[PDB]
Amino acid sequence: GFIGNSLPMQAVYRVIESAASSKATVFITGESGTGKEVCAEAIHAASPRHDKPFIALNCAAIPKDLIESELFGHVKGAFTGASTERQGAVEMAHNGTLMLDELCEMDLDLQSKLLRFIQTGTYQKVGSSKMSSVDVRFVCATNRNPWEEVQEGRFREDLYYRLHVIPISLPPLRERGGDIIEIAHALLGLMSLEEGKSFSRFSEPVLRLFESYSWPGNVRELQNVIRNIVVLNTDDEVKLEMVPPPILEHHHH
Template sequence: MPTLSHSKRILMVEDTASVAALYKSYLNPLDVEVEIVGTGQEALNFFAQQGDQLALIILDLRLPDMSGIDVLAHVRANAPSLPVIIMTAHGSIDAAVDAMRNGANDFLIKPCEADQLRVTVNKSLKPKVASQSQSERQEGEYHGFIGRSLPMQAVYRVIESAAPSKATVFITGESGTGKEVCAEAIHAASTRSNKPIIALNCAAIPKDLIESELFGHVKGAFTGAAAERDGAAELADGGTLFLDEICEMDLDLQSKLLRFIQTGTFQKVGSSKVKKVDVRFVCATNRDPWLEVQQGKFREDLYYRLHVIPLALPPLRDRGSDVLEIANALLALFSAEEGKDFCRFNEAVVKQLLEYDWPGNVRQLQNVIRNIVVLHNGEEVTAEMLPPPFARASGVEIASSHPNTRSEVALQTLTAREQSDDNLTVISKSDIEPLWKTEKRAIEVAIDACNGNIPQAAGLLEVSPSTIYRKLQAWQKTAAN
């Protein structure tokens, strides 16, 4: 063991003595000497007297006399290269962004496990050795995410801090911000990455089937259970169970989920046999989970079981130039898929992409880029190609720009029918037809006008292709019956 004089000195600023003592014990195996102070002023005094001897500062954000951000700002002003690790019990993305904006080198959430603290300290003491994750972040990509903005850098840090533990991560964020991508990133960065991550969308499964989907069922457990089936809990054994839209789960099943989380045991539907598995829980919602608790829609005890490490994903409008990075990546991807030549956006499009507030977030951006690629040709995306709400031009003009004989006939038929309707002065009850028939006729005309190209017809009708596919399938089933 090296002598104390050769040890690297670390200043730990932590106002809870028991926590400070615990974390100091975690660092005992390392060649470090840990000095502990409990207030921001004590930290500033120590730094003024012995700052040139420090190799690292571990700084709690919440101190009894001042904010840790104030201490960080003072350290950065006087020692720009001294590594600082921020620690906080409040896993707020805003706090992480603020800390990194002021120069923090890393970010950890309390409670922190020993291995994670040691790894983070070692990494900070060797700043010239960049990890694979750091390299990914510098290139703007991280386990499926694209973007290097400060809010996303904070997300990456929280993922890295939380991933090695078994602690449950509760992801919140608006629809389309990438909550499932986040869950997959946590799994990929964890020690469970060689095992499966099983996703269960609690909003997409009917109430009477979700228990079976979660825990499985035995043969004959209910009508239609022709064979025994493993549920998501068993399939995720050794890996990660991702419960998406967790606030949509029925209250009765929430109690069973709570017991499963507490004991790791469950019973298949229709079985008395108890099974035990080892899973790591990650859950997500686009709602405010605490508001759901207050409204009686989500169990408070389950909330506290799951809300261990909160992780809020920032909306796309708060991610700055990430919009362009994501748009360029999607343009390349969709162009390859569709066999198109698009490779860039012109300046007018870049301006509009950056100025738009993206209420649908990344999912909306995906739809916009795919719309452009499917309905247009060329190497450069121009403003005229942008779909609503960017431009008033709709898919009608696009689909009709080079009509063939078949589409001309279809569109003329539709126009004639509309003109005939305009000339009607008296409408009897017998002239009224069900709305679905009108809708069906409009969709058929659009598909005919586009020569059977459903994505192009969807652009003409200004709906998503999946809407048309779903309606066609429903009409086929009706006709079959």
């Protein structure tokens, strides 16, 4: 799902291709908005497991006390709101790839259970005593510094060294050269389709601004900017006056 042939991304692509044939755990880091799930899916797609499921568990989009239920499943009646027997992400990912996204959101109790599961493949549904097992290839990702999280006692040390086998550091958007405009063009067409518009090009000032702006929010911020432009304007061409703040203002500091 990655777009672009920039020098730093081509190093990423080589690691993805080599790692895909291995079952070794991948640990993706990088600034917010750099494409960790895109990277995780690309590893799966290049792997011999590509025809099996790819499952992403976003530990941030879930309350911390419910990550275990989302990960391992639960039986009906396990806790108060357990109206149904839920199948965990580990079961959805059996014979495939499981992405543990924003993994550092797990509490230390769940990190202990996860350490067990990563070693043995065994787990229990929440509220159940029965042991089960699955075969998943792990891909971990976080926007925190996984090492600082270990130092501040927030992440298990033995868990870190079990997961940090194949690290991948995604480059920030500002360092990806021609990728910025290529991604911007893809977003322009897609958001035009989503909004019923027909933008097809960027004016030269907009291209210069996009290529020199630091994009602290990376591709997420670029998505915001393109959506802002397409929603608020109707034209074939993106003009400089359409670019929202703080793009020009913070670019000059």
